[PDB]
Amino acid sequence: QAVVTQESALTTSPGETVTLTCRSSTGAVTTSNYANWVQEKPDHLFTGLIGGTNNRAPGVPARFSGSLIGDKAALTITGAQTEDEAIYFCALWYSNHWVFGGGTGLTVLGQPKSSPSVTLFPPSSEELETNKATLVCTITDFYPGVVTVDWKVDGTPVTQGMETTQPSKQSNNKYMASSYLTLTARAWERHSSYSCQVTHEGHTVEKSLSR
């Protein structure tokens, strides 16, 4: 019955200092919600760094440190390491229950920044005979690994029948993702304008195919 907020993503550099907040929609975070920051490494790895706001589980690199700033709980990685580029989930206690926030995807640039290469494919002709049309939009070599994807069928923004994988690290250390938009071959012949809009870092890139 409570929503715990966390930053979308944060980009810090090596040897730097970065800090994640953990907001409470019920009020300022108290010591009663022992925000327990937990780290997420890819392929389902989970370790808790900070517990009880202040205490650091034993064996957590001293650089990680918990505290309260203002009205929100806070994880402050001092001297951020390249091996810190990971997802950070915070948790808050509320008398009888616990509540995990949205988590922060933290990028620790260890390569310069790259833009997304967009490719929006049309339905295969073969697929069309199956009374199905799958718009395939691919996104490669973007870094940091965070993009927002939007479609617009006939200048109108689509709100359903669209799905996108979560950014997955490429061999280089950059990221890639693939967005799909499923349609009945009938729904396809009905519209004309199609576009895949990928925003990466606040810069949009469109790729459209007229039918």
């Binding site: 022992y34 589980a57 989930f89 229950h97 616990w98 494919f121 199956t130 799958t134 691919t138 979560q166």
Partner: protein, 214 residues
């Protein structure tokens, strides 16, 4: 100290399941056994927790009549039973331990069990070509509607090993679909034929598809 819980299960909708977490390690009584549900794209959700000694439990109302926490003292095992499983239950399920409030944390997490609510029976993919309609050039193969995981997509009998990217599959219609895009230089194509190689051993399927212009 390792909270071991099986890595995967398959379950048909309308059914129920019991996820076990056998606490290999220093204690049970000294610690609490919480349960968390991670779904790709929506972080963590606390399901609840259970006390070893007494059995008593507190939950997240959202799972109030979905989960049922239990614990068997003779085997240091903690179980979680979800009833009436539906398409949303498909998730990674973890059991982490809690240290009193005393330092107040979830120091050791179980590796999770990847539950999979699905009526799907083994089903082979359908290969669809993804081609440009206009220096370099991006070609692709749509491996749509297949179950179970996981499919093996390669390009030109292994010959194209760069300019290639095979993304993760996406779940929907209780079938997986993914794709492989290959950036072969604008000279090779259309000139040199480009063919993607998809295989789904789960069905023992193997298909070729030459990316033709259109």
């Amino acid at each position: 100290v390792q909270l071991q819980q099986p890595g995967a299960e398959l379950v048909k909708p309308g059914a129920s399941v019991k996820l076990s977490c056998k606490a290999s390690g220093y204690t049970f009584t000294s610690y609490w056994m919480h349960w968390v549900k991670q779904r790709p794209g929506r972080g963590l959700e606390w399901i609840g927790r259970i006390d070893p000694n007494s059995g008593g439990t507190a939950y997240n109302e959202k799972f109030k009549s979905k989960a049922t926490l239990t614990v068997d003292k003779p085997s240091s095992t903690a179980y979680m039973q979800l009833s009436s499983l539906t398409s949303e239950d498909s998730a990674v399920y973890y059991c982490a331990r809690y240290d009193y409030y005393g330092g107040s944390y979830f120091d050791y997490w179980g590796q999770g069990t990847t539950l999979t609510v699905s009526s799907a029976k083994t089903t082979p993919p359908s290969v669809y070509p993804l081609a440009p309609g206009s220096s370099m050039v991006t070609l692709g193969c749509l491996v749509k509607g297949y179950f179970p995981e996981p499919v093996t997509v390669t390009w030109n009998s292994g010959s194209l090993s760069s300019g290639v990217h095979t993304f993760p599959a996406v779940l929907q219609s209780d079938l997986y679909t993914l794709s492989s895009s290959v950036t072969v230089p604008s000279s090779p194509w259309p000139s040199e034929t480009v063919t993607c190689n998809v295989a789904h051993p789960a069905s023992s399927t193997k298909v070729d598809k030459k990316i033709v212009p259109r």
